[PDB]
Amino acid sequence: AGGVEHRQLLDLAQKHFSSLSGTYVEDAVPAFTPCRFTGSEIRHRDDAL
Amino acid sequence: REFGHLTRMRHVITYSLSPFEQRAFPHYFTKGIPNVLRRTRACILRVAPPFVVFYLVYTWGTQEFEKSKRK
């Protein structure tokens, strides 16, 4: 963002980033395990604070 | 005696679970039956021997009452 032209950034990205590995060795889908919510509590008692 | 003015405590952590997230009846006969047998064994030699001596005095006292009115 700022004083940038989009055409200039695109050709700089092809010059420096094109050797990044596109698809991978065996390229398995990155698995997304969701996370559940639990009603609970945690109490840390310290009277000197 | 109100709740924030009772005592001084440091370095103690407690963890709890919501009542709607747990079973109201956990292990009931798996844990509970061997637990009430440990508590029965731990107190049986203190409570029971007085009530045995009441039983022996009661039997001797009603039998020697009837072997007085007989002849």
Give the bridge partners for A46, in sequence order.
B10
- Chain A residues with CB inside 8 Å of B3's CB? none
Are A41 and B9 within 8 A, CB to CB? no
- Classify residue A30 by its DSSP letter: -
Which of A39, A43, A44 lies closest to B21 in CB terms? A39
How far is the C-alpha of A37 from the C-alpha of A31, rounded, in Å? 20
Residue B60 host element (H or E): helix B32-69
* Resolution to 1 decimal place, in Å: 2.4
Which of B40, B21, B37 lies closest to B29, judged by CA?
B37
A31 min Cα distance to partner chain B (Å)? 28
- Take residue A7 and report the two structure tokens written for it: 């055409």
Cβ of A39 under 8 Å from any chain B Cβ? yes
Q: Is residue B22 within 8 Å of residue A41, measured between CB atoms?
A: no
How far is the C-alpha of A20 from the C-alpha of A24, rounded, in Å? 10
A35 min Cα distance to partner chain B (Å)? 16
Technique used: cryo-EM
Q: Is residue A42 within 8 Å of residue B18, measured between CB atoms?
A: no
Q: Is residue A45 within 8 Å of residue B6, measured between CB atoms?
A: no
